[PDB]
């Protein structure tokens, strides 16, 4: 490399740069990090299938969130704190944690609805027509 604007008597005018364009062999990280993280993340989808009478849906969702947080802690240790871009697995972890938080909110709402009573809540006719006739038929329930 010769920098034409640099003075001929400057040290920066010339250099020889050797470059190494190296690609990571990802199979180690796929096996040990990505697959467990994805499997534990997709476990949150079981919260909807678990009955509200079980009283463990929030436990599952919050445990998935905790596991995702632990994984994010691990990866943030393995990578520099560069603000240039969010790492791909970091983007996945953030997206997963956001979805898990939304699933916790959904589960809390579902449990609230489940334990509603006519002494404490009013079941509107529109809510009945929506959630007892139309939607369960659409969902093949």
Partner 1 sequence: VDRLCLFVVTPVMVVGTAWIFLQGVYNQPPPQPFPGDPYSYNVQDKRFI
Partner 2 sequence: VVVSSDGSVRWQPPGIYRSSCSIQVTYFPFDWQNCTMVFSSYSYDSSEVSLQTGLGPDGQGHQEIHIHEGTFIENGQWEIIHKPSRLIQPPGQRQEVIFYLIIRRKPLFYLVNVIAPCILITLLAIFVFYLPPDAGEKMGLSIFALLTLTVFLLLLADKVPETSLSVPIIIKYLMFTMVLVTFSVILSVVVLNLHHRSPHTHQMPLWVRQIFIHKLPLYLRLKDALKEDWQFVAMVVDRLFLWTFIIFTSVGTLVIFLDATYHLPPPDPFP
Ligand X SMILES: *[C@@H]1O[C@H](CO)[C@@H](O[C@@H]2O[C@H](CO)[C@@H](O[C@@H]3O[C@H](CO[C@H]4O[C@H](CO)[C@@H](O)[C@H](O[C@H]5O[C@H](CO)[C@@H](O)[C@H](O)[C@@H]5O)[C@@H]4O)[C@@H](O)[C@H](O[C@H]4O[C@H](CO)[C@@H](O)[C@H](O)[C@@H]4O[C@@H]4O[C@H](CO)[C@@H](O)[C@H](O)[C@H]4NC(C)=O)[C@@H]3O)[C@H](O)[C@H]2NC(C)=O)[C@H](O)[C@H]1NC(C)=O
108: contact with partner 2 by CB under 8 A: yes
Residue 24 CB, nearest approach to partner 2 (Å): 18
Distance CA(37)–CA(94), nearest Å, equals 12
Q: Using the rule CB under 6 A, which residue among 8, 16, 18, 19 binds ligand X?
A: 19
Select the residue interacting with ligand X from 20, 21, 39, 138 (CB under 6 A).
Answer: 21
Helices and strands (H, E) in the chain, number of each type:
7, 0
Which ranges in 43-122 belong to alpha helices (H)?
46-49, 57-78, 88-114
Residue 139 touching ligand X (CB under 6 A): no
Q: Which residues bind ligand X (CB under 6 A)?
A: 1, 3-4, 17, 19, 21
């Amino acid at each position: 490399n010769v920098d034409p604007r640099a003075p001929l008597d400057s040290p920066s005018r010339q250099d020889i740069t050797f470059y190494l364009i190296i690609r990571r062999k990802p199979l180690f990280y796929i096996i040990n990090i990505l697959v467990p993280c994805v499997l534990i993340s997709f476990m949150v989808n079981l919260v909807f299938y678990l009955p509200a009478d079980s009283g463990e849906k929030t436990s599952v969702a919050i445990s998935v969130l905790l596991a995702q947080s632990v994984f994010l802690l691990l990866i943030s240790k393995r990578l520099p704190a560069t603000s240039m871009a969010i790492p791909l697995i970091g983007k996945f972890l953030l997206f997963g944690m956001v979805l898990v938080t939304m699933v916790v909110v959904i589960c809390v709402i579902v449990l609230n609805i489940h334990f509603r009573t006519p002494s404490t809540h009013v079941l509107s006719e529109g809510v009945k027509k929506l959630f007892l006739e139309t939607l369960p038929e659409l969902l093949h329930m």
